[PDB]
Amino acid sequence: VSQVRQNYHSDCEAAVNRMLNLELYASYTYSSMYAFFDRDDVALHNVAEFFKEHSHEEREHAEKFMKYQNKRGGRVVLQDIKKPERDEWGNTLEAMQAALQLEKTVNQALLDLHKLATDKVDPHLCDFLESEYLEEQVKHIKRIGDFITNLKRLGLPENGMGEYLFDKHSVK
Amino acid sequence: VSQVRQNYHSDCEAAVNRMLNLELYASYTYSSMYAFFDRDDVALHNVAEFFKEHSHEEREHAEKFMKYQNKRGGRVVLQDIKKPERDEWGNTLEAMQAALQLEKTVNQALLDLHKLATDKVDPHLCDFLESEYLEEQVKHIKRIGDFITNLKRLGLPENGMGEYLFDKHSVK
Amino acid sequence: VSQVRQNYHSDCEAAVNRMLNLELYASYTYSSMYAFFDRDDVALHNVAEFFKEHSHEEREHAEKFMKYQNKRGGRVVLQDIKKPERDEWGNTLEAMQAALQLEKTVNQALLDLHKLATDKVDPHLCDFLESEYLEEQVKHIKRIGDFITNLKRLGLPENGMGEYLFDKHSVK
Amino acid sequence: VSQVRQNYHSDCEAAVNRMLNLELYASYTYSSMYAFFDRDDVALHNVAEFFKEHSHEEREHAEKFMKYQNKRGGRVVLQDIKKPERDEWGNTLEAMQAALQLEKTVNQALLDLHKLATDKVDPHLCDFLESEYLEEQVKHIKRIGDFITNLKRLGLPENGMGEYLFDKHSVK
Numbered sequence: 001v002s003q004v005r006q007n008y009h010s011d012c013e014a015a016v017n018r019m020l021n022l023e024l025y026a027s028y029t030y031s032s033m034y035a036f037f038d039r040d041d042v043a044l045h046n047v048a049e050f051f052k053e054h055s056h057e058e059r060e061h062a063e064k065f066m067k068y069q070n071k072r073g074g075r076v077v078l079q080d081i082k083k084p085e086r087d088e089w090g091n092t093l094e095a096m097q098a099a100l101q102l103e104k105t106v107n108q109a110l111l112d113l114h115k116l117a118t119d120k121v122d123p124h125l126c127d128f129l130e131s132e133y134l135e136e137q138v139k140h141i142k143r144i145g146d147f148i149t150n151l152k153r154l155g156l157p158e159n160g161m162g163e164y165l166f167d168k169h170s171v172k
Numbered sequence: 173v174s175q176v177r178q179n180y181h182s183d184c185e186a187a188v189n190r191m192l193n194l195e196l197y198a199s200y201t202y203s204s205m206y207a208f209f210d211r212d213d214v215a216l217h218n219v220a221e222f223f224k225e226h227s228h229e230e231r232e233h234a235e236k237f238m239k240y241q242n243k244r245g246g247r248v249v250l251q252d253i254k255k256p257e258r259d260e261w262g263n264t265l266e267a268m269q270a271a272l273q274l275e276k277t278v279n280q281a282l283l284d285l286h287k288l289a290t291d292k293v294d295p296h297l298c299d300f301l302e303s304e305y306l307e308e309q310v311k312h313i314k315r316i317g318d319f320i321t322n323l324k325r326l327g328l329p330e331n332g333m334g335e336y337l338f339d340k341h342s343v344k
Numbered sequence: 345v346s347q348v349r350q351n352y353h354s355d356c357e358a359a360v361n362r363m364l365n366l367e368l369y370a371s372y373t374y375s376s377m378y379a380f381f382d383r384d385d386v387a388l389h390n391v392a393e394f395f396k397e398h399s400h401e402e403r404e405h406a407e408k409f410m411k412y413q414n415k416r417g418g419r420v421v422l423q424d425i426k427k428p429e430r431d432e433w434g435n436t437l438e439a440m441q442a443a444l445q446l447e448k449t450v451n452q453a454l455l456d457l458h459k460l461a462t463d464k465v466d467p468h469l470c471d472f473l474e475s476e477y478l479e480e481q482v483k484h485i486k487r488i489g490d491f492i493t494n495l496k497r498l499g500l501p502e503n504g505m506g507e508y509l510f511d512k513h514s515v516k
Numbered sequence: 517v518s519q520v521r522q523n524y525h526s527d528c529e530a531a532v533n534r535m536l537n538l539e540l541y542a543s544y545t546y547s548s549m550y551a552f553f554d555r556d557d558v559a560l561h562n563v564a565e566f567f568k569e570h571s572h573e574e575r576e577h578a579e580k581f582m583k584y585q586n587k588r589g590g591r592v593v594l595q596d597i598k599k600p601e602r603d604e605w606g607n608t609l610e611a612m613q614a615a616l617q618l619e620k621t622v623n624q625a626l627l628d629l630h631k632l633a634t635d636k637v638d639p640h641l642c643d644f645l646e647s648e649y650l651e652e653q654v655k656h657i658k659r660i661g662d663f664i665t666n667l668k669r670l671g672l673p674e675n676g677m678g679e680y681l682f683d684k685h686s687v688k
């Protein structure tokens with residue numbers, strides 16, 4: 001094994017690689033959302049830029065797992081980054097609903113990794129998750145849920161005026 | 173009696189303690205409103221922060237009565253702070269309507285204390301009320317009444333778009 | 345359930361509401377202590393201001409739990425804030441002794457919530473407790489215990505000169 | 517009558533002159549206290565300077581009544597300023613006790629003037645009293661009462677060390 005490796009279970013190493021892939025997948029989904037809202041027949045630029053920012057954040061999350069893996073003496077193993085589920089995202093409400101579910105999927109995988117880390121008695125991995133990932137997921141989920149509530153209040157999907165207002169006053 | 177006490181009737185001392193409790197009660201009600209508007213299924217953050225600011229203001233009003241009591245040689249006597257009337261506040265209009273009534277309740281109690289102070293020939297307590305409390309109540313009542321008028325104009329409770337617009341352009 | 349809720353047990357939600365109430369209770373107790381030391385027949389202003397600062401800190405702790413509850417998709421449920429145990433606090437030593445016990449009561453409730461969070465496999469709630477509450481309790485308990493030791497050394501309760509010296513050189 | 521005079525009763529004019537004299541009397545008493553604490557066989561300089569500052573404040577209070585009288589179209593009528601009650605003031609405790617009573621005497625005369633102003637339906641004089649005098653008396657009385665409490669705690673009159681400590685840590 002690596003000269004640095006200490007208290008790092010093979011199962012945790014593998015799960016970190018799988019989580020890295022999911023972070024990359026999330027990044028790629030958000031890129032798709034950005035591109036959709038930048039279309040000339042969609043044209044909600046503030047919405048598009050929200051999703052672009054999230055794409056960048058997810059890619060950073062992936063980089064941080066690569067660094068983590070190496071610090072522990074594990075080995076980064078990459079897999080294909082699957083294309084997003086959809087090619088088109090409907091409207092701001094549908095997209096935010098998809099984003100909420102994505103963030104919850106990410107969160108569940110982080111929680112599952114934390115449970116594995118617990119089971120393997122790996123406090124360093126627990127700490128990393130708790131300090132760098134779990135709170136940010138709660139914040140994202142809350143923000144996107146708040147947006148959904150507001151989009152519903154604004155009459156989405158039918159109310160175009162409401163959609164316009166959201167883009168111009170919410171997506172700060 | 174206290175070495176400092178001069179021209180301070182026992183009835184006024186007791187009424188100051190009761191008023192302190194009401195200020196605390198008002199603070200607590202506004203906290204409830206803050207929490208409600210911060211819910212993910214409510215999500216009117218500017219509204220929530222208006223109510224949080226008012227909660228803080230009411231707590232300051234209570235502190236000022238504690239200090240007043242001691243300055244006059246009275247004795248602070250605390251009672252339980254009753255929980256708010258409601259657990260949930262409906263929407264911005266209902267909440268503002270409740271706030272208006274709360275502010276009027278507070279005002280009436282301040283006015284009643286001023287009448288007692290008058291009857292007991294306590295110009296210092298009259299002055300304190302007039303200089304630190306009575307005008308601020310008039311301002312609050314006016315502001316919240318103006319908000320109500322605007323929420324009605326905006327089509328509350330039914331018009332969600334109107335509610336959104338209020339949160340984004342009024343609650344400065 | 346709330347659209348945001350994920351891995352948040354009903355028991356933990358309820359326990360967060362109970363803890364919020366205890367934080368508020370602690371705030372209110374410290375306010376009483378402030379008022380007592382501000383009395384003209386007590387007149388230990390630095391002591392009074394220590395307790396006022398702690399009252400404000402506890403209220404902030406309560407606010408942070410309200411925000412936490414909403415972030416997780418729980419619902420803030422308020423109860424009455426019970427008045428403090430005592431109306432008068434004796435002297436600096438007795439008050440500090442009461443404060444120590446209050447801080448220990450708060451701490452025990454935080455520790456119990458952490459155990460519940462552990463049992464329910466809620467690492468986010470564990471982290472929140474560990475990062476925002478548990479260390480601050482240890483610091484408070486240590487500070488107040490150190491004060492007690494010094495008040496005893498200074499001859500409290502009988503030695504008034506010692507009490508004066510403490511107010512003028514310790515309560516920074 | 518004076519061309520300016522409006523709603524100013526002769527009784528109120530006379531009472532303002534009497535109050536002016538009392539302010540001057542209070543100033544003179546505090547000067548005596550200053551001189552006593554500056555004696556080489558007393559030598560409590562911070563105490564002395566507290567009393568000197570109060571002497572100056574009382575003289576300012578007197579000047580403000582002279583200006584008030586002229587503004588209303590009354591006529592300043594001066595009387596002798598009686599020498600203080602005592603030539604020597606014992607110690608810090610006795611002096612503070614005398615100061616408390618002086619401040620209460622001043623306050624009672626202000627309150628009596630306010631009652632006369634009320635009876636004569638003179639809101640301008642009421643306002644002047646409330647805005648420029650009555651609160652400052654409450655503050656002085658509270659401060660001096662707090663000092664007394666501390667001097668007693670410090671073992672005055674017998675405890676010289678306590679008296680020294682008060683001069684060096686209280687009279688800010």
Ligand SMILES: [Cl-]
Binds near residue numbers: 005006007008009
């Ligand atoms: Cl290993």
Ligand SMILES: [Cl-]
Binds near residue numbers: 010
């Ligand atoms: Cl292994």
Ligand SMILES: [Cl-]
Binds near residue numbers: 030031034052055056
């Ligand atoms: Cl992108």
Ligand SMILES: [Cl-]
Binds near residue numbers: 086087088
């Ligand atoms: Cl598609």
Ligand SMILES: [Cl-]
Binds near residue numbers: 093094156157
């Ligand atoms: Cl849709």
Ligand SMILES: [Cl-]
Binds near residue numbers: 131132133135137
């Ligand atoms: Cl985080």
Ligand SMILES: [Cl-]
Binds near residue numbers: 177178179180181
């Ligand atoms: Cl009285």
Ligand SMILES: [Cl-]
Binds near residue numbers: 180181182
């Ligand atoms: Cl009475």
Ligand SMILES: [Cl-]
Binds near residue numbers: 228
């Ligand atoms: Cl609040």
Ligand SMILES: [Cl-]
Binds near residue numbers: 257259
């Ligand atoms: Cl309700």
Ligand SMILES: [Cl-]
Binds near residue numbers: 262263265328329
């Ligand atoms: Cl309604």
Ligand SMILES: [Cl-]
Binds near residue numbers: 304306308309
């Ligand atoms: Cl005011």
Ligand SMILES: [Cl-]
Binds near residue numbers: 349350351352353
């Ligand atoms: Cl859940």
Ligand SMILES: [Cl-]
Binds near residue numbers: 352353354355
């Ligand atoms: Cl549950």
Ligand SMILES: [Cl-]
Binds near residue numbers: 399
């Ligand atoms: Cl307080």
Ligand SMILES: [Cl-]
Binds near residue numbers: 429430431432
């Ligand atoms: Cl008691």
